[PDB]
Amino acid sequence: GGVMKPHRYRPGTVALREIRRYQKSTELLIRKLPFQRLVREIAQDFKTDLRFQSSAVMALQEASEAYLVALFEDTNLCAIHAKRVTIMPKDIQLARRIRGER
Amino acid sequence: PHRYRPGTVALREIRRYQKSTELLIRKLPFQRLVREIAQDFKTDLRFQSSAVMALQEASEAYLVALFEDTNLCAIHAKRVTIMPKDIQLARRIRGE
Amino acid sequence: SSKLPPPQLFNEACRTFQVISDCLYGSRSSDHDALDCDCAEDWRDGKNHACGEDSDCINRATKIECVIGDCNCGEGCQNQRFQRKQYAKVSVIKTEKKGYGLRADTDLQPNDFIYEYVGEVINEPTFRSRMLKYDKEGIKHFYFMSLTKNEFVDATKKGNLGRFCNHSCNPNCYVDKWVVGDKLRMGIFAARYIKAGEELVFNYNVDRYGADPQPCYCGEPNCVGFIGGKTQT
Amino acid sequence: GRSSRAGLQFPVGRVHRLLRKGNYAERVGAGAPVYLAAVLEYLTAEILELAGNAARDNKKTRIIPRHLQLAVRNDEELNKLLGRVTIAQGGVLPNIQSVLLPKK
Amino acid sequence: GRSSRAGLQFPVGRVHRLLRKGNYAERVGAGAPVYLAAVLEYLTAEILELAGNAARDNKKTRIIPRHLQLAVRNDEELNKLLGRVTIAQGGVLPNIQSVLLPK
Amino acid sequence: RRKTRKESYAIYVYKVLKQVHPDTGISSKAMSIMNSFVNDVFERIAGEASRLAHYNKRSTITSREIQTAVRLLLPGELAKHAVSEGTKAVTKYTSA
Amino acid sequence: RRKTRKESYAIYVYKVLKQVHPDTGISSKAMSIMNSFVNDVFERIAGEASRLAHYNKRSTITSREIQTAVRLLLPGELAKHAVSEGTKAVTKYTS
Amino acid sequence: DNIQGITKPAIRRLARRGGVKRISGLIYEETRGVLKVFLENVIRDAVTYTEHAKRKTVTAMDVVYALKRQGRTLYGFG
Amino acid sequence: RDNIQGITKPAIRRLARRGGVKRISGLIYEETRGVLKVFLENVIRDAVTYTEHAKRKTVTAMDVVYALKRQGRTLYGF
DNA sequence: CAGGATGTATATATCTGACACGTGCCTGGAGACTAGGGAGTAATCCCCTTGGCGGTTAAAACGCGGGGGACAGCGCGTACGTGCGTTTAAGCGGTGCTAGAGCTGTCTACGACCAATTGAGCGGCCTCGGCACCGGGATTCTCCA
DNA sequence: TGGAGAATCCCGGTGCCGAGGCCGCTCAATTGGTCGTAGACAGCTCTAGCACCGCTTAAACGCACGTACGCGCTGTCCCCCGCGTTTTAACCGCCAAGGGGATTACTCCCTAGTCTCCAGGCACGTGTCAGATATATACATCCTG
Ligand SMILES: [Zn+2]
Ligand SMILES: [Zn+2]
Ligand SMILES: [Zn+2]
């Protein structure tokens, strides 16, 4: 008999499918609890035994995700400018340089 | 018949104009540009000399920063010249 | 080419079955709702295809098909073709060693819709039941392809013209997964230039459970004598 | 009510109180709260209208943050006014670069 | 004078008057203008000291805008404090990218 | 016993929504977003009117200062219609 | 003498310059830049203290608001030395 | 160590919302570094507001005002 | 009129030299003139708005500085 | 070879969590009146803006040769996308405990406020030297034999 | 690589106007009383944040495979640069009206503060519905005799 495995999707097709799915939805893309642990670890270096409201961690996660999404949008535009379709660390560093954060 | 290579004069001008501090746009043409732009908002506007100098300073500083970032984009794209799409990219990254 | 040069029927032909063209599966998916895109048509009477077959329409670029009637282009959307059957022209040629080939009937432009493999989609215990009943019955031709990893397709019961193919180590067509009506389906597409007459044979990439396959009669230096899959199951 | 006298929905009185006790100037004119309430109600109506149209075009009857995000980012002028604000749980506009699509 | 009592050169009285008449709060604490004058004196002293150093490094004893520019841009924290600031007649740092230099 | 009287623009945004589209509702989080937006626009216009009063050595925010702030803040047709609405409002208010 | 009094920070910036650099002068344009800079930083710090007082339902700008605004606006080592100078000045002034 | 808790698939998803099609393997360290700098600045300003207000909990309003100070005002929390 | 061509090619080339540019495409000059027209249009618009509010007929240096301040490109020395 | 118990897909009456509307209450808004000071308006002055003219000459325009860098194709290899199977924390709910936010009460220190005073600081004018500019030689960099 | 050549740098000499200081003046800064509300502080309440735990399962992870895309090389060609020659208009100094910014004088209406009163807005129950869920139910699977 035998299982007959056909050809998979070409590289990029599932990627574009994810592009459309995540640009159409609104749920958070970062895991809430690991991010909360990251927030408490970063806050540790200023005041010991700091407490956070859940809405504060949620506002930080929203702000963080919006900032990274906008940075990757700018990175994608500079990447596509340079005749590539693959972003590189240099691209993000260029984005931050032009934005004035460096 | 002694000619410089296409580009060393560019570097000497870069060192020269980055070393000096003076307005690089011609005063009277820029003042005519300012008055022309101002005509479409209110008729018979007067300008203090210091206001035109402040406009020329801000104009030169903004263009300098824009060209510096456009140059960084050009170098990023494995080139040494600037193209219109580099300026459009720079202004897009900035947020206009 | 013209290597597989009296065409045969479907039910010098192969074994009999029932010709199907619709969804007559076992139970069922894909769950991906394709929403109505704002594609500009250039279509009133068919001067150009609305969701064009090789232009930049967002639905066709990701192996997604519009449903008929709900996309903004209406019915002229060429990315509706699994629901409207814009198939190519093949026929059934009898070959003494390759068996039955889908000979091309018109000279086919590369990178276009050729045909669709439709049949019965089933799960794994009923699938191994089909395997056991068929190799206890004694068939020598096996259509136990996998739509997804879980489900499987079979066309010898109620299939269509996509049965008459084989394995070639140099493929001319290929098969790729598409989605239509929230249903995952399969389509065979060309990649190279296709001339009328030669059989359209691709890479099966079978992981056969048996030990003795028929040899790959492609006769090329790229053929290892047998087919070549992924795992030795 | 002072709001009904100007034909506005937004509270002229509350705006007047916020202006006096919000530490913006020593004195606040009488026409300033009326004018400010008019501008606030107009901008609120414009963005709620664009959001409502976006929600109705997506076959929903409840305005959600996503529809506000679309309302802002799809109207050039409001985009300019609100270019540096983040709308909570709003996502981004569907924008796929042409170059990312397959070739001929 | 309250300036000499607090050991500051900036006028705490003037700062206090600007705070009261500047529509910042209804009441202004007595320690606030002293603290603000101290912070202004520190920032002014840092920028002036760096501009002076740069001026000696250009064989000039009179600080001109170019020296203030060099002073601002060579201090990373002042550059961060003044990233949206433009100094008139300041010019630009001598920064030539490596890729343009002859090889 | 109730907790604390906290004010918001909730009911006014809801009345405006019922005035422009009676059969449309709004989520609580969206109402929060609208409240933050109204407070933001308010803070910007009040800050600019404050700076205008300060720069011209005046201690009164009148409808003129708000009008100039509106012309500075809204880009184009938004400003033109905002000035139209404000003029209507102030006129009808002072003439009744 | 038939001219409106236009205040400045000129003489104080000059005093600070003479205290930090013994033999050094300063041009008119550089003094204008420094004066606008001092007015700018003053406006920033006072605005930040004003909004900080407003946020916490306070109506008074005390040393605390100025201290927090200075720590918010000045990056790193600048903030450290500025808060040191502020505390020093208030300590001397209350005595 | 918790900066690696913002896992590589999540970073990929973040890029996916931004329209990125292919991602180099070296991106993830740069992205975690950028995230660390941004969160450090916003959290530092939030902690400065809490220390001023004599409260031990970082409140939502503190985060909103901290973000607004850096020109990234956030709607939907007050 | 067509006085915007008063900003000539070598002056734009000078600004570019100060910006670190080494080679300039021919289209850069028209693109820069258009960008500068947009920028100056916005700044002069804000300046004229300040001047008309102040009941003055001359745009002063302070109006231009405050206008630049509104756009986060503050100018010192006027 | 045989039905019964069992597993599975299907349509379903229902359950939940978020939203629209009615209820009591309280505090802030509205109305009314008065005082004082900011501002509105007329009037005058005089600074500095606008306009003009003429001579200088430096920069801009323009033309042309040429080189080197942009761009496109080709080819190549490796790294990243996709997928499968394995595992693990994420998430959810459920439970418990107490820190601290939030509100109140009382009191007091601290700043608003006002009048008198006086010197710090600002405008005007006056002086001399740092610098802007120029010329001459010296070094430094570039490029072609 | 070194000599020629152009560009720039350094180093003194002259002129000049602007920095820096003094003088007279005025109004804002300082001091001393006087008071009234903001806030510091202790206490109490009650929400909500943190901590733990079990369970389920969706996503992360690791490896395998393969292809397509990044990157380096090479050719072509064309466009911008270096530079010389010609032209035009900016620029600098000087002058002449005169417009309008800035100040003055004085009045007066508009807004802060206070007092009086009541209903609009907010917290909270109460009812209603998209969307998810446990449940009757039809058809195929195994299951033992
Ligand atoms: Zn389409
Ligand atoms: Zn379509
Ligand atoms: Zn073969």
Short mmCIF file of N, CA and C in Angstrom, two decimals, chain A residues 20 24, chain C residues 33-41 50-52 56-61 64-67 69-74 77-80:
data_model
loop_
_atom_site.label_atom_id
_atom_site.label_comp_id
_atom_site.label_asym_id
_atom_site.label_seq_id
_atom_site.Cartn_x
_atom_site.Cartn_y
_atom_site.Cartn_z
N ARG A 20 -1.48 37.57 6.46
CA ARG A 20 -2.89 37.96 6.36
C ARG A 20 -3.65 37.66 7.65
N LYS A 24 -5.21 40.60 10.18
CA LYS A 24 -6.66 40.71 10.26
C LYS A 24 -7.17 40.62 11.70
N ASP C 33 -11.30 31.37 6.53
CA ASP C 33 -12.28 32.20 5.84
C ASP C 33 -11.60 33.26 4.98
N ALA C 34 -11.73 33.12 3.67
CA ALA C 34 -11.16 34.09 2.74
C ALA C 34 -12.18 35.20 2.52
N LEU C 35 -11.83 36.41 2.95
CA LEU C 35 -12.79 37.50 2.87
C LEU C 35 -12.73 38.19 1.51
N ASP C 36 -13.78 38.96 1.23
CA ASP C 36 -14.02 39.58 -0.07
C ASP C 36 -12.99 40.67 -0.33
N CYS C 37 -12.04 40.39 -1.21
CA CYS C 37 -10.99 41.36 -1.49
C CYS C 37 -11.50 42.47 -2.40
N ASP C 38 -10.75 43.57 -2.43
CA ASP C 38 -11.06 44.76 -3.22
C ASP C 38 -10.25 44.78 -4.51
N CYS C 39 -10.11 43.62 -5.15
CA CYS C 39 -9.35 43.53 -6.39
C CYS C 39 -10.07 44.24 -7.52
N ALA C 40 -9.35 45.12 -8.22
CA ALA C 40 -9.87 45.73 -9.43
C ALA C 40 -10.00 44.68 -10.52
N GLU C 41 -11.09 44.76 -11.28
CA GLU C 41 -11.46 43.64 -12.13
C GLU C 41 -10.76 43.68 -13.48
N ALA C 50 -10.66 38.86 -13.84
CA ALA C 50 -10.80 39.77 -12.70
C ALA C 50 -9.77 39.54 -11.60
N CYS C 51 -9.85 38.41 -10.90
CA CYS C 51 -8.73 37.96 -10.08
C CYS C 51 -7.82 37.12 -10.97
N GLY C 52 -6.85 37.81 -11.58
CA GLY C 52 -6.12 37.25 -12.70
C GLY C 52 -5.27 36.06 -12.34
N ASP C 56 -1.34 40.21 -9.86
CA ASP C 56 -1.18 40.42 -8.43
C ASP C 56 -2.55 40.58 -7.77
N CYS C 57 -3.24 39.46 -7.59
CA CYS C 57 -4.42 39.41 -6.73
C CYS C 57 -4.06 38.64 -5.46
N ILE C 58 -4.47 39.19 -4.31
CA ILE C 58 -4.01 38.73 -3.01
C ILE C 58 -4.55 37.35 -2.66
N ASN C 59 -5.69 36.96 -3.23
CA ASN C 59 -6.24 35.64 -2.96
C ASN C 59 -5.42 34.54 -3.62
N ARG C 60 -5.12 34.68 -4.91
CA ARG C 60 -4.45 33.63 -5.67
C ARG C 60 -2.98 33.51 -5.30
N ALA C 61 -2.41 34.54 -4.67
CA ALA C 61 -0.98 34.53 -4.39
C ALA C 61 -0.62 33.61 -3.24
N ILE C 64 -5.16 30.42 -2.18
CA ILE C 64 -6.48 30.61 -1.58
C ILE C 64 -7.43 30.90 -2.73
N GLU C 65 -8.62 30.31 -2.69
CA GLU C 65 -9.59 30.52 -3.76
C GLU C 65 -10.83 31.23 -3.26
N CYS C 66 -11.29 32.21 -4.03
CA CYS C 66 -12.52 32.92 -3.70
C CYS C 66 -13.71 32.00 -3.90
N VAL C 67 -14.76 32.19 -3.10
CA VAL C 67 -15.99 31.44 -3.32
C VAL C 67 -16.72 32.18 -4.43
N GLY C 69 -19.39 34.30 -5.99
CA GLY C 69 -20.47 35.23 -5.70
C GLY C 69 -20.27 36.24 -4.58
N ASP C 70 -19.27 36.03 -3.72
CA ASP C 70 -19.14 36.88 -2.54
C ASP C 70 -17.94 37.82 -2.64
N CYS C 71 -16.95 37.47 -3.46
CA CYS C 71 -15.87 38.39 -3.76
C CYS C 71 -16.41 39.56 -4.59
N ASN C 72 -15.75 40.71 -4.47
CA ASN C 72 -16.20 41.94 -5.13
C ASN C 72 -16.16 41.86 -6.64
N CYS C 73 -15.32 41.00 -7.20
CA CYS C 73 -15.23 40.80 -8.64
C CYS C 73 -16.40 40.03 -9.22
N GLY C 74 -17.20 39.37 -8.39
CA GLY C 74 -18.36 38.67 -8.90
C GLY C 74 -17.99 37.30 -9.44
N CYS C 77 -13.99 36.38 -11.60
CA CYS C 77 -12.77 36.12 -10.84
C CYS C 77 -12.19 34.78 -11.28
N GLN C 78 -11.04 34.83 -11.96
CA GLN C 78 -10.37 33.61 -12.42
C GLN C 78 -9.82 32.78 -11.27
N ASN C 79 -9.65 33.38 -10.09
CA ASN C 79 -9.37 32.64 -8.87
C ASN C 79 -10.69 32.20 -8.23
N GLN C 80 -11.42 31.39 -9.00
CA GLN C 80 -12.59 30.65 -8.56
C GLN C 80 -12.62 29.26 -9.19
#
